[PDB]
Ligand binder design. Structure first.
Ligand code: 0LL
Ligand code: NAG
Ligand code: NAG
Ligand code: NAG
Ligand code: NAG
Ligand code: NAG
Ligand code: NAG
Ligand code: NAG
Ligand code: NAG
Ligand code: NAG
Ligand code: NAG
Ligand code: NAG
Length: 339
């Protein structure tokens, strides 16, 4: 017998104590080693309600990632709350590692195993575990990178699809690689991303067909973001410690719904901090080839308002609330207290 509850979680990882990489350093001192032989108990004839949009596990992961970044990525100038902080900003080794979230004694994590689970409501196939799977704390906008994939069909997630103000998470069932490079020996901040146009357009077509099932077969159209901060209008992510900002106009191309798609990118030093603490200037990029190859496993979308009297629904890449990144992985878990 159990009940929904919140508690202080701890983390586990396979971090190396001899690594200088920042995620490894953080996890070495903030996490315990993983369980080599984890146990999972599949519950019989149980019905449990989940709500990925109201899950304290997400807030806790957010706090960890903020703590990790604050200790690891030092901007040269911090501009928070009228106070100016000038400090050293050394170049670091940066590459996210999987982090597991675990319950203390008296508590357990319930895991929804329904294959078409959208993140909210009842789940028929539930199991109990002591820890989540390994989740990489990848901070990005527009595109979700290096995450887990949906096992069967593409999944559409939203707290309220009818409310256009609520972010939509698209969960892909097949990854598409994105190849981003700041080339070696000149604009040191000029970069680009390469994506297989055949693979991407095929996946995007499948996404449109899924959205149709949720929007009464209305016509599905993609458009570039209307405006706002660069972190929202562009695909932003961190590669090897460097902040990349990529133009995704070519990705969301209704005409294509075949060759290599090349997105123009820029490395930015002056960014709006995702932690919500104003603006910051980070150090200029390292020398040589800067390269990151990632799997696109999800998409964050915002739906246009004012389309009720038309047969079209318009979707634009967006997000920015990094908590949604954690929701895309934590959706199937909830903490309960054993009475
Ligand atoms: N004011 C913040 C907090 C918040 C809350 C809800 C909605 C939007 C936002 C804004 N988001 C951002 O500013 C932000 O995500 N920046 C950023 C920076 C670097 C990288 Cl790599 C990256 F992915 C992202
Ligand atoms: C529930 O579990 C059974 C047995 O594995 C499986 O056949 C069925 O597809 C599951 N139901 C859902 C909704 O995934
Ligand atoms: C990239 O995608 C492939 C195919 O799903 C997967 O095998 C691989 O683990 C992914 N790489 C990651 C997680 O960075
Ligand atoms: C992905 O999901 C779609 C339905 O959303 C399905 O038609 C397609 O077969 C799936 N792709 C793979 C590789 O399983
Ligand atoms: C998820 O499923 C529940 C019913 O199980 C439904 O109420 C809700 O609208 C669904 N959410 C989405 C985004 O389809
Ligand atoms: C979903 O959003 C619509 C549009 O704002 C709103 O009318 C409705 O009350 C919302 N539904 C729920 C479950 O709150
Ligand atoms: C990434 O793109 C570069 C060319 O820009 C290529 O040399 C490299 O092989 C690509 N990486 C992968 C994994 O395809
Ligand atoms: C692009 O993707 C297709 C499958 O959609 C694949 O057959 C082809 O080899 C890819 N092109 C390149 C340049 O790798
Ligand atoms: C979408 O169209 C198909 C016709 O192939 C129909 O079976 C289905 O009911 C429609 N879905 C909605 C929700 O409009
Ligand atoms: C992306 O590129 C297109 C085509 O050059 C351009 O019109 C658009 O303004 C760019 N978007 C941003 C956010 O810079
Ligand atoms: C979308 O695809 C068409 C194919 O002809 C192309 O002409 C157009 O430039 C594309 N839009 C972009 C690259 O933003
Ligand atoms: C995604 O995972 C691959 C393989 O570990 C890594 O090389 C790449 O840098 C990752 N991408 C991001 C944005 O962290």
């Amino acid at each position: 017998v159990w009940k929904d509850a919140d508690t202080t979680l701890f983390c586990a990882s396979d971090a190396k104590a001899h690594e200088t990489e920042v995620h490894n350093v953080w996890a070495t001192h903030a996490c315990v080693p993983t369980d080599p032989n984890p146990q999972e108990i599949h519950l019989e004839n149980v019905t449990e309600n989940f709500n990925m949009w109201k899950n304290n596990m997400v807030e806790q992961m957010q706090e960890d990632v903020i703590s990790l970044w604050d200790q690891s990525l030092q901007p040269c100038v911090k501009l928070t709350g009228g106070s100016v902080i000038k400090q050293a900003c050394p170049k670091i080794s940066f590459d996210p590692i999987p982090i597991h979230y675990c319950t203390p004694a008296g508590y357990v994590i319930l895991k929804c195993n329904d294959k078409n689970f959208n993140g909210t409501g009842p789940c028929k196939n539930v199991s109990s575990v002591q820890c989540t799977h390994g989740i990489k704390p990848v901070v990005s906008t527009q595109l979700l990178l290096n995450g887990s994939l949906a096992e069967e069909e593409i999944i559409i997630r939203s707290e309220n699809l009818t409310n256009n103000a609520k972010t939509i998470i698209v969960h892909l069932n097949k990854s598409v690689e994105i190849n981003c490079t700041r080339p070696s020996n000149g604009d040191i901040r000029k970069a680009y991303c390469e994506i297989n146009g055949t693979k991407w357009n095929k996946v995007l077509k499948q996404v449109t067909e899924k959205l149709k099932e949720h929007f009464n077969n209305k016509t599905i159209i993609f458009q570039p973001p209307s405006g706002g901060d660069l972190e929202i209008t562009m695909h932003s992510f961190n590669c090897r410690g460097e902040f990349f900002y990529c133009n995704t106009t070519q990705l969301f191309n209704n005409t294509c719904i075949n060759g290599t798609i090349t997105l123009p990118c820029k490395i930015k030093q002056i960014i709006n901090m995702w932690q919500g603490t104003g603006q910051a200037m980070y150090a200029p990029p390292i020398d040589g080839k800067i390269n990151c190859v990632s799997n696109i496993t999800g998409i964050l979308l915002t739906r246009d308002g004012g389309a009720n009297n038309t047969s079209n629904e318009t979707f634009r890449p967006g997000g920015g609330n990094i908590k949604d990144n954690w929701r895309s992985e934590l959706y199937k878990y909830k903490v309960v207290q054993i009475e």
